[PDB]
Amino acid sequence: AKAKTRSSRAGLQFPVGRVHRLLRKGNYAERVGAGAPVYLAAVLEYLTAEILELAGNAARDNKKTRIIPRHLQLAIRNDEELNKLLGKVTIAQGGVLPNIQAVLLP
């Protein structure tokens, strides 16, 4: 018959079948609902978009078209809620946020 992939059926870009397979093979629970992979793929796609928008904006601020790990670190550390979500996460080759204490200033 005809196959409209579940990602296109739900309107997402992330794979619904792959997320469903990883939920089934990840031994998280005995059974996996039909809407759970759709929900999880939607959440993952939204979070990826939220990182990538700020990463592209930071790359624009650096006059670079490509996104490097420094741009990802800047985007993550500058945003409030994304920094809270990734407070215990180190991005390799990401550097640090430029910050000098006011006491050290001349």
């Binding site: 670190q73 430029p98 910050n99 000098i100 204490q101 050290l104 001349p106």
Partner: protein, 98 residues
């Protein structure tokens, strides 16, 4: 000859190491230190190169964060110079070495 004040070649180099994103520790001394530390747990280990790189990246991120907390603790003491007591306080408050 032209000399800069003691407290301006300090600001300078803070802005460019915070702007830059390289490592700042020589690779071979760190790899050698890793092998020295690891040969106490398993003799004749062959560290994958990516593993040494990951260890270095994590160690430097940890030390940079520790130095940020150390600087905060030193400024809290109405000081500018960081002393070993600041590192000890930062570690104690963080949770390490309780």
């Amino acid at each position: 000859p032209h000399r800069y004040r003691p407290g301006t070649v300090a600001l300078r180099e803070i802005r460019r190491y915070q702007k830059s994103t390289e490592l700042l520790i020589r690779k071979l001394p760190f790899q050698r230190l890793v092998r020295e530390i690891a040969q106490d747990f398993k003799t004749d280990l062959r560290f994958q190169s990516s593993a040494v790189m990951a260890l270095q990246e994590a160690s430097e991120a940890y030390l940079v964060g520790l130095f940020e907390d150390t600087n905060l603790a030193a400024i809290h003491a109405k000081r500018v110079t960081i002393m070993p007591k600041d590192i000890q306080l930062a570690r104690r408050i963080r949770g390490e070495r309780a």
